[PDB]
Design a protein around this ligand. Structure first.
Ligand code: MG
Ligand code: MG
Ligand code: MG
Ligand code: MG
Ligand code: MG
Ligand code: MG
Ligand code: MG
Ligand code: MG
Ligand code: MG
Ligand code: MG
Ligand code: MG
Ligand code: MG
Ligand code: MG
Ligand code: MG
Ligand code: MG
Ligand code: MG
Ligand code: MG
Ligand code: MG
Ligand code: MG
Ligand code: MG
Ligand code: MG
Ligand code: MG
Ligand code: MG
Ligand code: MG
Ligand code: MG
Ligand code: MG
Ligand code: MG
Ligand code: MG
Ligand code: MG
Ligand code: MG
Ligand code: MG
Ligand code: MG
Ligand code: MG
Ligand code: MG
Ligand code: MG
Ligand code: MG
Ligand code: MG
Ligand code: MG
Ligand code: MG
Ligand code: MG
Ligand code: MG
Ligand code: MG
Ligand code: MG
Ligand code: MG
Ligand code: MG
Ligand code: MG
Ligand code: MG
Ligand code: MG
Ligand code: MG
Ligand code: MG
Ligand code: MG
Ligand code: MG
Ligand code: MG
Ligand code: MG
Ligand code: MG
Ligand code: MG
Ligand code: MG
Ligand code: MG
Ligand code: MG
Ligand code: MG
Ligand code: MG
Ligand code: MG
Ligand code: MG
Ligand code: MG
Ligand code: MG
Ligand code: MG
Ligand code: MG
Ligand code: MG
Ligand code: MG
Ligand code: MG
Ligand code: MG
Ligand code: MG
Ligand code: MG
Ligand code: MG
Ligand code: MG
Ligand code: MG
Ligand code: MG
Ligand code: MG
Ligand code: MG
Ligand code: MG
Ligand code: MG
Ligand code: MG
Ligand code: MG
Ligand code: MG
Ligand code: MG
Length: 204
RNA sequence: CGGUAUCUAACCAGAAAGCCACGGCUAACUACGUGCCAGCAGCCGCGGUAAUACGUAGGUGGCAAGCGUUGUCCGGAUUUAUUGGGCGUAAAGCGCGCGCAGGCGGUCUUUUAAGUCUGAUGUGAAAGCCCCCGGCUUAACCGGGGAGGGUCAUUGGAAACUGGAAGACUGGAGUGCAGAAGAGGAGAGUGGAAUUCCACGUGUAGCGGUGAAAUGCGUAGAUAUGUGGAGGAACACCAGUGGCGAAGGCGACUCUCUGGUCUGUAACUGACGCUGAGGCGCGAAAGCGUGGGGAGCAAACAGGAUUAGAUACCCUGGUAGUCCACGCCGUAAACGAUGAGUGCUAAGUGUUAGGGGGUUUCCGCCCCUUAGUGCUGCAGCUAACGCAUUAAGCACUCCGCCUGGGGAGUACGACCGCAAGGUUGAAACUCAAAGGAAUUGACGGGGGCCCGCACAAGCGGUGGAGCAUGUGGUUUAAUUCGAAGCAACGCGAAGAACCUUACCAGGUCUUGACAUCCUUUGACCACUCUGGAGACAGAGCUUUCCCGGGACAAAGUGACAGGUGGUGCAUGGUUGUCGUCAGCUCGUGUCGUGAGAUGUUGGGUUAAGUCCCGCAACGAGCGCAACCCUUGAUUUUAGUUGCCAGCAUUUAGUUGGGCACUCUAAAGUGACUGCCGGUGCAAGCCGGAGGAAGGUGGGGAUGACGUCAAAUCAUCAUGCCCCUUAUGACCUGGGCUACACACGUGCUACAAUGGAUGGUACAAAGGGUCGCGAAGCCGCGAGGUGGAGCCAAUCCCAUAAAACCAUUCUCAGUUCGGAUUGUAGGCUGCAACUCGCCUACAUGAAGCCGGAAUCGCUAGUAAUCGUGGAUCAGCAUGCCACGGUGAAUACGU
């Protein structure tokens, strides 16, 4: 049995899609500009635990906000790394780009950030059983009513692939008033390719 | 022996370390090579292009002057069990009795001293094991002393136990006396139902048989029916986990001859007993010999059916046999799968044959007791099932039997038999299992409830024809690759003329078509001419960068790039399918030696493990339901590009005017078993009212744990393997469109509910800026010119078609059908031959409802008719959406 994408099921119902701009006859021109912007942000800020990026476009001006769990590298004492973004985005956007940075409180509640921390341990030769369990017990203190995660692929170096999942709490997928986050990430190993799936039933 | 052992003097780290294993058993793991090959192995078993198991290295682990392998013996092996096992179902109780030898044997007294216990003497050599000392520089090794070792011989004691002898007793055993029950056995005779045959009345056409039939019997008169005769076998009701017997077994009645058992008494004898190898007898059915008998039944056999075949099941016949006398045979799931004797160890309740007591006149009820026969259950036992005073519990005596499976109850030998065969009973070889009980699933041509267009009741199709399209096969330089029952086959492909294109022919390039870092200029090109099929080769105009920075470009080099090359059985992600089926699990608790179980089962109800009640369980999670969208009714907000009530005007809702009504879209109401009646205890069920809507209203989105090593390395990503002057890169042409053929999916028809001609009405949902494209004019037509308006509730696409109204055709291969083909055109595109779509004229094919088989659909559904959109320069009979008209049937499982 195949499951619908939990995020996609709730667009426009309880949540709102990330890129929120309106234009006609410039749709494909604007849309692929965003796909370029996201590609560069995900490159330089690979270790900054960045999860949510949205595009706010209005009359030749590009407004972008970055949701970061640890903005200290992104902004703070240096005060010069964030300005390089506007200098490294003017060449491809060709528009006056302003970037905003927003703190993420309780970073363990965000399904995006939990995903790579599980993932980063898998190529650190950590057992798959331990890595998931450690993240499950960390998020339950944050205030979530549900979590279940699986890791699938050539598991622990095994020749035959299989999946393993661990759950505790309440994760009702079929409920539409759920507010369930989702994230999928790649674990790059020397025996193959592994992927992790995490979804959290948030509080409200 | 022999200048041997042994001392002291000096020089030298210098001459002196190998063997086996590293998956588990079992201490010790990583690389490379190979790729079910080479090979390894004591067992389990490893090797099929990431091997801790094969080969070699590095490292490690056991020992060490060694270390491994083989052969033999003991151990582990309780696997011959005296110490120290067993026989209900795993191997293992003879089919049963009578009994010689042997083994074992109630209570007391006296005696004896064979067994039993004990002392002394003699001996059991030396060496060896063991204990205490001593010598070799230690040890091994060697001495001194001691100990142990016997069913040993002579002799002295003890008398409890077994044995011997002499007596005594009665709880064992047996006799006597008084009763009782019984299909216990052998012999002789008799009875009644019923079947068959025979003879004679009555009578007419079938009888008999099967899932259906047929063979067979009958007009030579059957079946049926009434009367009489002959003969053989078994004994209806009674009849009962009732009775009798050692077992096999014994069922009509009477008599004769016979065996055993139970109860009561306490007269009698006084251990006279239990088991019992060899031996001797009995012993279902079939079978054998001799003489009878023969009604039903029936191996063999014959015929008829069934079947792909049917030496069978089914039907019609039928010989030995079954019955009797005598004599053999000696087996059985001969079973309670449980040897015989004896004693002890909770209860509850039926029944057979007796005895005692209390109530009562009897009857009857109750209690106690003996011997049998059943059921339920404690302790105990058991691997479990289960047994449980009729033990598989606790004990003693005697007999029989067993030691992994097959070979095999076979071969040879012997005994027995008339024969068939019986009894006794191996080995070579081969395997690492064979087996008992219970658990979770699955399966059933087992059973009980249920659901789905599953069948049934209907309607319309496919399979027959022409064309469209995908696939197989085949042909081709190539016909690029993938999917293969449901769950590939108008599928990836929501568009193959060049591109796409992944394939082929020819022509070309090697840091390259695409990115990074090198170094000099900084713009680099573009264009024109020539050879050009083009890619590309040779010349000129210009290359203006901007701000020491830069991205690209010029130039050659490297690191490098590039693969739609392989493996979907190395993978991530994505999807199908069972199936929108109602299930799948967990936490704590409890039961079981254990795997497991319970919850999740039982009684109702539901679409639903949806809910209620009960319950050794109490709760939870993913699923169901609801929350989401859409349609159906309505209120407030809002009147523009929408609408026109009431108006004046216009060819026309037009213009002026107004949101009245529709309308559009934001917020709300509304449906929740809400209410009433009956039924039920509750869930719930049936009906009714209100309402637009009533029982999850209609339709969508939503697809649990998992199964198919299901599909995709070709959307993307990616481990390993492979190619790299090519398996990478550019150009033209061809091909993916072939064609004797087979299959799947569709379109059009085979006409009169129809064809043709003329007039006219009624929609919804969408698209439009390098776009839609009107009026007007032209052409028979496809189309051409033209440019209005529209960045759109405004303008265009855009006249909806079936339907309705008139005329004509008159049942024919036709005024049906349109394939096919010749000519003449239009449109896109640089280009329409391979290979596009449309128009005009002419040609006019198969086809007159489709065999076997098979598909879809339950209401605005099927059926039928039009419309729009994605991909798109052009091209859809495919796909995805929209509306018009609008059925038949559902008894039922
Ligand atoms: Mg000398
Ligand atoms: Mg010396
Ligand atoms: Mg020295
Ligand atoms: Mg070990
Ligand atoms: Mg290897
Ligand atoms: Mg080994
Ligand atoms: Mg090796
Ligand atoms: Mg080595
Ligand atoms: Mg060593
Ligand atoms: Mg030594
Ligand atoms: Mg040796
Ligand atoms: Mg040996
Ligand atoms: Mg032994
Ligand atoms: Mg045994
Ligand atoms: Mg026994
Ligand atoms: Mg057996
Ligand atoms: Mg047996
Ligand atoms: Mg017996
Ligand atoms: Mg005797
Ligand atoms: Mg005695
Ligand atoms: Mg004796
Ligand atoms: Mg001696
Ligand atoms: Mg000494
Ligand atoms: Mg000695
Ligand atoms: Mg000595
Ligand atoms: Mg005595
Ligand atoms: Mg004496
Ligand atoms: Mg007596
Ligand atoms: Mg008798
Ligand atoms: Mg008799
Ligand atoms: Mg008679
Ligand atoms: Mg028939
Ligand atoms: Mg007659
Ligand atoms: Mg008896
Ligand atoms: Mg008698
Ligand atoms: Mg008698
Ligand atoms: Mg009796
Ligand atoms: Mg006497
Ligand atoms: Mg006896
Ligand atoms: Mg005998
Ligand atoms: Mg006989
Ligand atoms: Mg005979
Ligand atoms: Mg005879
Ligand atoms: Mg026959
Ligand atoms: Mg017969
Ligand atoms: Mg006889
Ligand atoms: Mg036999
Ligand atoms: Mg026998
Ligand atoms: Mg019997
Ligand atoms: Mg037996
Ligand atoms: Mg006994
Ligand atoms: Mg007994
Ligand atoms: Mg009894
Ligand atoms: Mg053997
Ligand atoms: Mg054997
Ligand atoms: Mg024999
Ligand atoms: Mg013989
Ligand atoms: Mg077995
Ligand atoms: Mg079994
Ligand atoms: Mg239905
Ligand atoms: Mg056809
Ligand atoms: Mg193909
Ligand atoms: Mg289809
Ligand atoms: Mg080409
Ligand atoms: Mg030039
Ligand atoms: Mg030139
Ligand atoms: Mg697969
Ligand atoms: Mg349902
Ligand atoms: Mg269960
Ligand atoms: Mg139930
Ligand atoms: Mg309901
Ligand atoms: Mg439920
Ligand atoms: Mg009511
Ligand atoms: Mg009603
Ligand atoms: Mg639902
Ligand atoms: Mg496969
Ligand atoms: Mg495949
Ligand atoms: Mg690849
Ligand atoms: Mg094709
Ligand atoms: Mg016509
Ligand atoms: Mg043409
Ligand atoms: Mg014509
Ligand atoms: Mg014809
Ligand atoms: Mg006709
Ligand atoms: Mg088109």
């Amino acid at each position: 049995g195949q499951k619908v994408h939990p995020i996609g099921m709730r667009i426009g119902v309880i949540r709102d899609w990330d890129s929120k701009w309106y234009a006609e006859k410039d749709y494909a021109d604007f849309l692929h500009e965003d796909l370029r912007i996201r590609d560069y942000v995900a490159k330089r800020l690979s270790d900054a635990s960045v999860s949510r990026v949205e595009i706010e476009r209005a009359a030749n001006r590009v407004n972008i906000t970055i949701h970061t769990a640890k903005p200290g590298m992104v902004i703070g004492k240096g005060g010069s790394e964030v300005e390089a973004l506007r200098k490294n985005l003017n060449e491809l956007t060709q528009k006056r780009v302003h970037i905003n940075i927003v703190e993420i409180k309780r970073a363990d509640l965000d399904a995006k950030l939990v995903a790579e921390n599980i993932a980063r341990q898998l190529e650190g030769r950590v057992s798959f059983r331990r890595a998931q369990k450690q993240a499950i017990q960390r998020t339950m203190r944050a205030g979530a009513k549900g979590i279940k995660t699986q890791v699938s692929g050539r598991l622990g170096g095994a020749d035959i692939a299989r999946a393993e999942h661990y759950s505790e709490g309440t994760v009702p997928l079929h409920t539409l008033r759920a507010d369930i986050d989702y994230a999928w990430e790649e674990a790059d190993t020397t025996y193959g390719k592994l992927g992790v799936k995490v979804w959290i039933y948030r509080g409200e």
